[PDB]
Amino acid sequence: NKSTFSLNDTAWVDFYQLQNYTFPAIIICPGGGYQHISQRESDPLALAFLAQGYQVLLLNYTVMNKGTNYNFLSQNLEEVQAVFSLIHQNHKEWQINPEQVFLLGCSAGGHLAAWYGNSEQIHRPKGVILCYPVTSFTFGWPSDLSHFNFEIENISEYNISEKVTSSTPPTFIWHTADDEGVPIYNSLKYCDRLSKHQVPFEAHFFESGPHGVSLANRTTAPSDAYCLPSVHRWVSWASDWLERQIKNLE
Amino acid sequence: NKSTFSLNDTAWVDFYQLQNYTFPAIIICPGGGYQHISQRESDPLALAFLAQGYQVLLLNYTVMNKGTNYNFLSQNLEEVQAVFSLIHQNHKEWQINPEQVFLLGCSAGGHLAAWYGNSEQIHRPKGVILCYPVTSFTFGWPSDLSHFNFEIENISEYNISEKVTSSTPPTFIWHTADDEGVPIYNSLKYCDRLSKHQVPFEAHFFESGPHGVSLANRTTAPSDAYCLPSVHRWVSWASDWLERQIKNLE
Amino acid sequence: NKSTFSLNDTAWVDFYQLQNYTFPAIIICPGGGYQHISQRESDPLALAFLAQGYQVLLLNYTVMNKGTNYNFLSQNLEEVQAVFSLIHQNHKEWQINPEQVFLLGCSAGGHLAAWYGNSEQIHRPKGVILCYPVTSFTFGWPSDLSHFNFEIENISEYNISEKVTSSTPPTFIWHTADDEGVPIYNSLKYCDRLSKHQVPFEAHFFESGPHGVSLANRTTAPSDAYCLPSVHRWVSWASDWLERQIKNLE
Amino acid sequence: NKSTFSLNDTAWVDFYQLQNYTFPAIIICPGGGYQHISQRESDPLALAFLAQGYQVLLLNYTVMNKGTNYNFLSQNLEEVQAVFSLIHQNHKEWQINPEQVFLLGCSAGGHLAAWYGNSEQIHRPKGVILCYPVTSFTFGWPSDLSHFNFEIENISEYNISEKVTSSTPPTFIWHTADDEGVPIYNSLKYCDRLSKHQVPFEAHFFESGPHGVSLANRTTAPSDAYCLPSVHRWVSWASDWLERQIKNLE
């Protein structure tokens, strides 16, 4: 039902599997500002989909929580890539349909997602979902000009907004129109710079809700304010969206 | 059940009423590029809401379909205003709760809506909805630089995007991310320039769908492509949104 | 959009029509214990469907409200029949698809519906819906042994439960499990005596709710207790059911 | 997140727990004709709820799969009882709200559920759900007069239909109107003999679908016929129902 698989020196990859087929899997990228891994965006999130009928690959990509040296922002893309690789070779055993692998991410964890959303091969996700994602370190986030800042002059490079082209996979993006950790602009501008390239996508923007809202269910929420029923609707919208994509495969 | 009320020299105002109370009414602004009145955004639209439990005031605001002279773009705001006025005085007879009047508009008909969405009094809509609205005559629409163009140098004035402030009522905006008549940018940029002013709103953006989609139901659609079930979901989202606002009025 | 058509000496037949095709029509049978016509089960109900994309034929079948003599319970079946007849001949003008005509009824109005649900010809409804229907004058209703009682020894004949066979069309039945006007047994036993004949159907039974609940919307409800959001869900279930049947054709 | 707890000589009790509170837990009773434990009604079912925000206690009650001797049909009630007991004492650690414990069961697993649905104490479930349950060994099931038949003359005693009174907790019952393993009559008659006792409940009956349908999702279904989207709606209806009860408890 579950077993972890070591990736690199610092990169866990939890793999959730069940059994009734070739269930379409989906890799998740929990947020946490590259610092850590927002727990309330992992296991809980996993179950959600695992219950919605999806093999889950929760990626614990390297972050500033294991002795940070260089901008592993590049080393990450590798880690996620390694996941697909893992599938590409263990797709028979994993009971996964290699032609039905998607990528998920929220907050910063999203940034990596959109990032990986280009320049790859038989590791390209047929689609991605970005929950209140981070479009660029130039969009209200990182809040502090100098924090997780470990150099690298080229900052415009770490703006996955520009890195969007016609080849970019279909995406689902939602965001609370009051998220103080990261302005909706992130998702907003991203959509604009996503439609102009005739990229099929769906977007949803809720009135209010704090950053890291996740499922907005009593499963993912510290206080009461983090438990929003109206916002929780996304996990449902996303379900329909995904499957709507599956059907449009052959 | 229904009876029209003459407004100005050129401005019909269809008023739909039913009876079980003080049902919250809602004024609609059918699109049609100020040229005419998109029929597939009127009566059908009316019923939708009238069925969802709302008194309907379909406004047939003056357009280039009755001998156009001057930019009545100002004379319109008056017309819609007259509607509220009509309610403000006939709210007891109309069985309408004056404290529960909302404004609806789509495509260009939306532009007027957002426009009226500021600078008024006891004629201020507790909320508005804008279906693939027109934010400004500078956002991909009017397609032709010179068509419905009847002068008036000051063009930036007819951009209801800037005309959005903290006083702007809560709004619901959706748009098909491929509408060729008017780019999603309209609603998109609008949202951005709507959130920054801490204005509570909800947004939805569908993958594909032609302009004037309306209800996306076999009630509002010329061909098959104009009949989209996934898009039709907005009229449902909108219902919940509205009522969510009503409850938030006690 | 609407125009009535005289049927018999005493039998109105309101016909609601709209225009974008050949929209599937649906005849309705408002309840009212054969005494009158529950208004809160007519016009409001009509719009509901008319909005859900269906031509509506509201039948004002003869009742004890126009000088009652004999048990017109037979004369009714005629009236409804006449409706189909009307369609069969004016199906081109009515813009109705003759192969997509359904029957609706609630409370007693339902009894007639199920009744007509057998022994006919090119007037057979491809499906019927029965809102808290009356299965027989022997199922807790009529409450009074002697009221609308105008003789006719053969009472078992007026039990449309037995009158159900394999030929009976697919039906949708819902009922509030506390309806004091008529026990759920009506719909309950009906389902049993509906499944045994391998008749495809769908049923729903809500916890609580008074008789005549109709849409349970602020459109159909005298007091607050008659406004139930959870119950209102049926009009939505019914929508999907119907259309699920439409698709289940050519 | 998960750990089993031995109950009796032959009775596993899988306990699924998560952590953000006092989440309302729910015990499940997987079906399998008392012979075994329908796998497709356990773990998958658990996740569903565990994702819907519920602590899950999957009960692996004794069955003819571990050397059957006597009609443990009585020994079962004990096993389930022990579960509540376990909670009643470990409700603080389990992070469970003892005043919010519900019972679930399907097919035969349901029979036990309804059964336990009376004659107990601080182990009474505030509500129960029964997916295509078994009302009595006299309702089309057991199919064979002599199979799991291990004596016990008193057969009418094993009919949990009669065992329903005003004290019986609110229940949610659904059933496919074509289930060949067990006729809908089970749930049908049960509803009748459930309403007459003014017991608040909700029912749903789908047109078609084989026995053991479970979630009707690609998570619980051997072939394609066992994957029904329309039927899968129950797990959603159930969610709302349950929570509707939580709110309406305090």
Give the pair of three-digit tokens for residue A157: 């490079």
The helix-helix angle for C43-51 and B43-51 (nearest 10°) equals 120
Quote the CA–CA distance of D97 and D25 in Å, as a whole number. Answer: 7
Pairing of strands B171-176, B102-106: unpaired
> DSSP assignment, residue C121?
S
> At a CB cut-off of 8 Å and minimum separation 6, what does C34 contact?
C63, C64, C73, C108, C148
Method: X-ray
Quote the CA–CA distance of D26 and B163 in Å, as a whole number. Answer: 53
Quote the CA–CA distance of C197 and A161 in Å, as a whole number. Answer: 61
Pairing of strands D2-4, D12-16: antiparallel
Burial class (CB in 10 A: 0-12, 13-18, 19+), C197: exposed
**Three-class SS state of C89:** helix
CB-nearest to D18 from A44, A50, A52 is A44
Judging contacts by C-beta atoms under 8 Å, the chain A residues touching residue D16 are none
Q: Where are the alpha helices (DSSP H) in chain B?
A: 43-51, 73-90, 107-116, 185-195, 229-232, 234-247
Question: How would DSSP label each residue in C207-250?
Answer: S---TT-TT-STTS-SSSTT--HHHHHHHHHHHHHHHHHHHS--
Q: Cβ of B21 and C218 within 8 Å? A: yes
What is the chain A residue with the closest CA to D223?
A21
**Which amino acid belongs to residue C203?**
A
> With contact defined as beta carbons under 8 Å apart, do A187 and A132 qualify?
yes
Q: Cβ of D47 and A47 within 8 Å? A: yes
Q: Cβ of D50 and A53 within 8 Å? A: no
Quote the CA–CA distance of A9 and A62 in Å, as a whole number. Answer: 9
Quote the CA–CA distance of A176 and A166 in Å, as a whole number. Answer: 26
CB-nearest to D207 from C184, C189, C202 is C202
Structural domains of chain D in order of their starting residue, each with its CATH number: 1-250 (3.40.50.1820)
What is the chain C residue with the closest CA to D186?
C192
Phi then psi for residue A188, to 5 deg, are: -50, -70
**How many Cβ atoms sit within 10 Å of the Cβ of residue C79?**
22
Judging contacts by C-beta atoms under 8 Å, the chain A residues touching residue D17 are none
**Which amino acid belongs to residue A219?**
T
Distances from the Cα of D27 to the Cαs of C245, D7, D47, D112, D123, in angstroms?
37, 14, 13, 12, 11
The helix-helix angle for B185-195 and A185-195 (nearest 10°) equals 170
> With contact defined as beta carbons under 8 Å apart, do C208 and C100 qualify?
no
Quote the CA–CA distance of D218 and D230 in Å, as a whole number. Answer: 13
Distances from the Cα of A136 to the Cαs of A27, A63, A79, A195, B184, in angstroms?
21, 17, 20, 18, 22
**Which amino acid belongs to residue B167?**
S
CB-nearest to C202 from D200, D202, D206 is D206
Q: What count of residues does chain A have?
A: 250
Question: How would DSSP label each residue in B166-195?
Answer: TTSPPEEEEEETT-SSS-THHHHHHHHHHH
**Which amino acid belongs to residue C136?**
S
Given the structure tokens 């049926």, which residue do they identify? C234
Q: Cβ of B20 and C51 within 8 Å? A: no
**How many Cβ atoms sit within 10 Å of the Cβ of residue C131?**
29
> Which run of H or E residues covers position D89?
helix D73-90
Give, rounded to a whole angstrom, the gap between the first and last alpha carbons of chain C: 29
Given the structure tokens 């609205």, which residue do they identify? B133
Quote the CA–CA distance of C229 and B240 in Å, as a whole number. Answer: 12
Give the pair of three-digit tokens for residue C97: 């698809």
Instruction: Enumerate the β-bridge partners of residue B42.
Output: none
> With contact defined as beta carbons under 8 Å apart, do C163 and C203 qualify?
no
Closest CA to A85 of A72, A98, A103, A104: A98
Q: Cβ of B50 and C51 within 8 Å? A: yes
Task: Quote the minimal CA–CA distance from B43 to chain C in Å.
Answer: 9
Given the structure tokens 């002599």, which residue do they identify? D146
Q: Cβ of B20 and C43 within 8 Å? A: no
Distances from the Cα of C159 to the Cαs of C112, C114, C133, C163, in angstroms?
10, 10, 12, 7
Closest CA to C10 of C79, C62, C71, C57: C62
Distances from the Cα of D65 to the Cαs of A27, D94, D187, in angstroms?
38, 30, 27
> With contact defined as beta carbons under 8 Å apart, do D234 and D174 qualify?
yes
Q: Do chains C and A touch (3 or more CB pairs under 8 A)?
A: no
Phi then psi for residue B163, to 5 deg, are: -65, 25
Q: Cβ of B207 and A202 within 8 Å? A: yes
Judging contacts by C-beta atoms under 8 Å, the chain B residues touching residue C220 are 20
Question: How would DSSP label each residue in A177-239?
Answer: TT-SSS-THHHHHHHHHHHTTT--EEEEEES---TT-TT-STTS-SSSTT--HHHHHHHHHHH
Q: Cβ of B51 and C53 within 8 Å? A: no
Q: Do chains A and D touch (3 or more CB pairs under 8 A)?
A: yes
Quote the CA–CA distance of D134 and D141 in Å, as a whole number. Answer: 7
Q: B33 — alpha (psi -120 to 50), left (phi > 0) or beta?
A: left
Please, how many CA atoms are within 13 Å of residue B197, restricted to the half-sphere of its CB? 19
Q: Cβ of C188 and D184 within 8 Å? A: no
Q: Is the dihedral of CA D160, D49, A231, A202 positive or negative?
A: negative
> DSSP assignment, residue D198?
T
> Which run of H or E residues covers position B58?
strand B55-60
Quote the CA–CA distance of D240 and C176 in Å, as a whole number. Answer: 17
Distances from the Cα of D126 to the Cαs of A208, D112, D117, D244, in angstroms?
34, 16, 10, 12
Quote the CA–CA distance of D128 and C176 in Å, as a whole number. Answer: 19
Give the pair of three-digit tokens for residue A181: 């950790």
Give, rounded to a whole angstrom, the gap between the first and last alpha carbons of chain D: 28
Torsion over CA of C206, C212, C217 and C221, rounded to 10 degrees? -130
> With contact defined as beta carbons under 8 Å apart, do C185 and C136 qualify?
no
Burial D128-165 (b: 16+ CB within 10 A, else e): bbbbbbbbbbebbbbeeeeebeeeeeeeeebbbbebbe
